[PDB]
């Protein structure tokens, strides 16, 4: 039967909402390019 | 790589080509939904 009785009070209804949204998005491109050339030509002046 | 000599006459040539290619891709998707 509990610890107390109701001496007075009010009756009706209760309504509650908690609502939570959390979005994270990441996009990442890392592009590197090395192009190297060396070339040489030699000959006396025949070769 | 390329190399040449030219000069009676003589001609010499060397060539080399090398290619290596790698593609790796992974995709992971997960959904958990619970309602009570």
């Amino acid at each position: 039967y509990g610890t107390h009785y109701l001496q007075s009070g009010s009756l009706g209804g209760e309504y509650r909402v908690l609502f939570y949204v959390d979005s994270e998005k990441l996009k990442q491109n890392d592009f590197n390019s090395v192009e190297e050339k060396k070339c040489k030509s030699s000959g006396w002046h025949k070769f | 790589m390329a190399s040449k000599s030219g000069f009676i006459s003589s001609q010499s040539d060397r060539g080399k080509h090398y290619i290596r290619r790698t593609k790796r891709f992974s995709h992971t998707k997960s959904v958990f939904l619970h309602a009570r």
Side-chain angles (χ1 to χ4, degrees), chain A:
Chain A
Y1 297 108
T3 57
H4 295 78
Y5 77 87
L6 316 180
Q7 185 64 47
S8 62
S10 177
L11 300 100
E14 318 179 280
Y15 166 51
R16 306 196 306 277
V17 185
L18 169 72
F19 163 83
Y20 175 87
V21 182
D22 173 318
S23 176
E24 177 276 357
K25 175 174 182 172
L26 178 152
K27 300 171 54 175
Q28 171 297 304
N29 172 348
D30 49 313
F31 165 19
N32 299 305
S33 171
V34 172
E35 177 187 329
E36 319 201 54
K37 301 183 180 177
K38 295 183 178 182
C39 47
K40 62 176 66 173
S41 303
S42 299
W44 70 254
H45 65 283
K46 300 186 68 178
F47 175 83

Side-chain angles (χ1 to χ4, degrees), chain B residues 2-19:
Chain B
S3 61
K4 308 286 186 172
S5 62
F7 178 20
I8 62 173
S9 182
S10 179
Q11 174 74 30
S12 305
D13 174 301
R14 208 287 197 287
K16 181 178 179 180
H17 315 142
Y18 170 96
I19 300 94

